[PDB]
Amino acid sequence: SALPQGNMKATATSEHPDVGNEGLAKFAIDGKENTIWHTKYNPVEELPQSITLELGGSYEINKFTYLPRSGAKNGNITKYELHVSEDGNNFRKISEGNWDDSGSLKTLKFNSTKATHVKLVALEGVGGFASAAELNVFA
Numbered sequence: 001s002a003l004p005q006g007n008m009k010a011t012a013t014s015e016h017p018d019v020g021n022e023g024l025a026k027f028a029i030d031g032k033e034n035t036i037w038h039t040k041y042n043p044v045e046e047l048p049q050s051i052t053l054e055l056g057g058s059y060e061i062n063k064f065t066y067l068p069r070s071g072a073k074n075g076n077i078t079k080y081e082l083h084v085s086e087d088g089n090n091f092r093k094i095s096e097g098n099w100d101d102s103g104s105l106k107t108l109k110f111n112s113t114k115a116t117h118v119k120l121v122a123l124e125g126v127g128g129f130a131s132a133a134e135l136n137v138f139a
């Protein structure tokens, strides 16, 4: 079951200002599929870039989901790392891999681990950007 996004805070290395349905980091956890976090594209900041979710406490987590934007593909993430921290400072890599560029939900499962923060690192994305409609973390 998903940890409540409402208790979370989102920050990112790069984010596009609020021009509607993009591109602030907080849009990745607002519960709306029509709103997205998107990395700066004026002018563009190159990958890699990341987004960090402060969980709102220490939880033991085993799953992560990435929902891409709908109706367009720019920034759909195709190569990632997932890192965790228990102190907000030190991060450790727990997952890495590839995703297809489609709009489909991407799911990561991993051995249960304690975390106060989860960081999604975007190494590759459509168009040289990174974006996300919704991010969720599961215990």
Ligand SMILES: CC(=O)N[C@H]1[C@H](O[C@@H]2[C@@H](O)[C@H](O)O[C@H](CO)[C@@H]2O)O[C@H](CO)[C@H](O)[C@@H]1O
Binding pocket: 022, 038, 041, 072, 073, 074, 075, 129
């Ligand atoms: C609606 C949309 O997809 N906006 C993204 C935007 O995508 C393209 C532009 O790249 C192009 O110049 O014009 C298109 C018109 O159909 C469309 O707006 O590109 C942005 C990054 O440059 C960002 O990804 C927008 O989310």
Ligand SMILES: [Ca+2]
Binding pocket: 027, 028, 029, 030, 031, 032, 033, 034, 035, 036, 037, 132, 133, 134
């Ligand atoms: Ca959203």
Ligand code: NA
Binding pocket: 054, 088, 117
């Ligand atoms: Na934090």
